[PDB]
Amino acid sequence: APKSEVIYQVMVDRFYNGDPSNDDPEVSKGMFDPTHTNWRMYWGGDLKGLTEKIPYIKGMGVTAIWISPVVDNINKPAVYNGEINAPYHGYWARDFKRVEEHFGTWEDFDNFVKVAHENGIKVILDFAPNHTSPADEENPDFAENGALYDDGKLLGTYSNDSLKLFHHNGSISNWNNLKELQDKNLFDLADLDQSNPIVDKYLKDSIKLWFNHEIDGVRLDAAKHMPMEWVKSFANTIYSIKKDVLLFGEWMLSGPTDPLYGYNIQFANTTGFSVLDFMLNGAIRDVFGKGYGFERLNDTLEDTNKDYENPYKLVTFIDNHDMPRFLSLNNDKDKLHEAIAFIMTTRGIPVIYYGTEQYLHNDTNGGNDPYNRPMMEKFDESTKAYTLIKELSRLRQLTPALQYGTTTARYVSDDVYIYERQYGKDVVLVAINKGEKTTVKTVKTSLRKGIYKDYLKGLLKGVELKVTKGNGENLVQDLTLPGNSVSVWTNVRV
Numbered sequence: 001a002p003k004s005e006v007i008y009q010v011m012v013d014r015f016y017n018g019d020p021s022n023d024d025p026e027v028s029k030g031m032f033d034p035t036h037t038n039w040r041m042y043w044g045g046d047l048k049g050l051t052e053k054i055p056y057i058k059g060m061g062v063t064a065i066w067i068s069p070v071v072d073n074i075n076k077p078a079v080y081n082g083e084i085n086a087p088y089h090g091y092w093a094r095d096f097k098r099v100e101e102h103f104g105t106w107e108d109f110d111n112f113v114k115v116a117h118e119n120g121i122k123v124i125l126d127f128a129p130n131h132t133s134p135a136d137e138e139n140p141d142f143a144e145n146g147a148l149y150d151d152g153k154l155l156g157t158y159s160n161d162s163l164k165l166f167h168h169n170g171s172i173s174n175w176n177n178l179k180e181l182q183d184k185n186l187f188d189l190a191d192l193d194q195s196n197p198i199v200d201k202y203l204k205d206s207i208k209l210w211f212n213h214e215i216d217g218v219r220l221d222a223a224k225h226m227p228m229e230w231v232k233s234f235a236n237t238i239y240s241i242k243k244d245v246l247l248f249g250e251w252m253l254s255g256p257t258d259p260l261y262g263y264n265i266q267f268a269n270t271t272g273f274s275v276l277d278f279m280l281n282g283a284i285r286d287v288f289g290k291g292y293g294f295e296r297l298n299d300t301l302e303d304t305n306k307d308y309e310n311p312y313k314l315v316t317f318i319d320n321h322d323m324p325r326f327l328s329l330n331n332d333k334d335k336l337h338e339a340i341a342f343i344m345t346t347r348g349i350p351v352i353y354y355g356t357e358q359y360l361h362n363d364t365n366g367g368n369d370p371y372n373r374p375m376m377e378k379f380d381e382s383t384k385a386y387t388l389i390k391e392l393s394r395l396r397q398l399t400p401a402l403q404y405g406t407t408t409a410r411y412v413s414d415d416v417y418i419y420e421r422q423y424g425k426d427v428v429l430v431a432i433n434k435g436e437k438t439t440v441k442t443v444k445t446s447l448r449k450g451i452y453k454d455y456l457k458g459l460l461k462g463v464e465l466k467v468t469k470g471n472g473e474n475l476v477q478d479l480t481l482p483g484n485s486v487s488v489w490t491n492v493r494v
């Protein structure tokens with residue numbers, strides 16, 4: 001009876017500012033914008049603020065918070081074209097053994113973990129061991145020159161790499177060559193050389209430190225840019241210190257025809273890390289955000305379920321901090337609700353990017369980075385999306401069928417998708433109609449004969465199901481699905 005999870009993804013600087021005293025710390029001053037009009041500066045969200053909002057997050061049935069990296073990031077900005085670029089997102093580390101002072105101290109981090117755990121919520125740390133920070137090997141005055149510190153002790157810089165901590169191979173230019181992706185710099189980010197025993201020990205010591213502060217898992221940033229065999233050894237290190245851990249990597253795929261898809265599969269099948277589900281994400285955005293027919297979604301789903309050895313550990317999502325938010329792609333709240341209902345009732349672990357439930361989006365530059373990281377604005381626990389996100393996670397706790405069940409398509413047309421999830425005798429049947437009101441002629445199901453009410457109680461216009469005994473598979477006849485509706489039927493007692 002494995003535990004089912006539901007993840008909430010928080011960019012700390014953009015979520016809630018609970019402490020004004022760390023907005024603009026003396027050691028790293030001048031990268032804070034109180035007005036929230038320069039989108040590349042720190043805006044002030046912090047660990048105290050996130051801790052204060054744990055009840056709000058718990059109210060959605062979230063079981064785990066994926067926190068953006070909270071390791072100490074560079075204390076001087078990367079100035080390009082005179083533009084101040086602050087490491088507000090956390091992906092430009094200077095010290096993997098310290099907490100970022102804009103977000104808090106070790107005590108603030110321990111309190112956050114304490115309160116999360118008291119609420120039944122795991123802490124998943126976004127960890128980015130591929131690189132430190134932007135560097136120019138010929139200009140040590142730019143940013144912090146990729147500096148790596150060990151709990152305040154400087155280990156070296158990109159321009160003076162006495163310990164040979166970094167690759168000095170230029171930047172990635174051939175993005176389909178695996179060796180280039182691993183051994184060169186992602187943009188101007190100083191690439192760490194995990195083959196160096198110094199770097200290898202440092203990163204493994206660092207992750208042990210964070211697990212000493214009782215985190216529950218890791219989201220591995222830039223997983224395609226490190227040697228697969230090193231990542232596997234990193235996973236082994238983690239497994240040796242905590243058995244019940246949630247490990248998944250960000251292996252970006254560009255689309256259905258990504259030449260490296262097979263390495264992504266190998267990674268997910270062998271390293272000990274699962275992966276974020278970019279194949280399914282593309283189909284989700286195609287069919288709910290771009291008008292494609294459900295055959296695309298169901299086809300992608302069937303493919304991923306046979307390619308990955310453990311699809312039940314894929315981490316699914318509709319948007320994130322590296323792509324436009326769903327509402328920037330298609331400002332349709334009904335389509336958003338349908339996509340949420342889909343990932344919540346689909347195998348694996350669904351992710352809600354913070355503020356989705358508040359319909360948060362900024363459409364500047366198409367909603368792309370940085371505008372997909374707006375400040376959280378409201379904490380309204382009565383929105384339709386909040387209610388939806390809180391109800392379906394309850395079904396995940398009542399049956400493994402949603403995270404761990406088989407998937408059987410019962411009806412696939414352009415705008416109607418009826419699929420069935422089964423685990424043991426547990427069955428959940430879901431019908432999504434993203435088009436106009438229509439009547440489906442015949443659907444088979446393994447639900448027993450009877451009348452099933454909509455689990456969502458009409459929240460998304462759902463309707464009852466009249467299942468007749470078929471002898472063999474049971475039958476529904478002449479089912480009328482309202483326009484823009486989701487109906488969820490289950491034999492699991494609620």
Ligand SMILES: [Ca+2]
Pocket residue numbers: 017018019020021022023044045046102
């Ligand atoms: Ca603050």
Ligand SMILES: [Ca+2]
Pocket residue numbers: 028072073074075100101102
């Ligand atoms: Ca810092």
Ligand SMILES: [Ca+2]
Pocket residue numbers: 130181182183184191192225226227
């Ligand atoms: Ca690398």
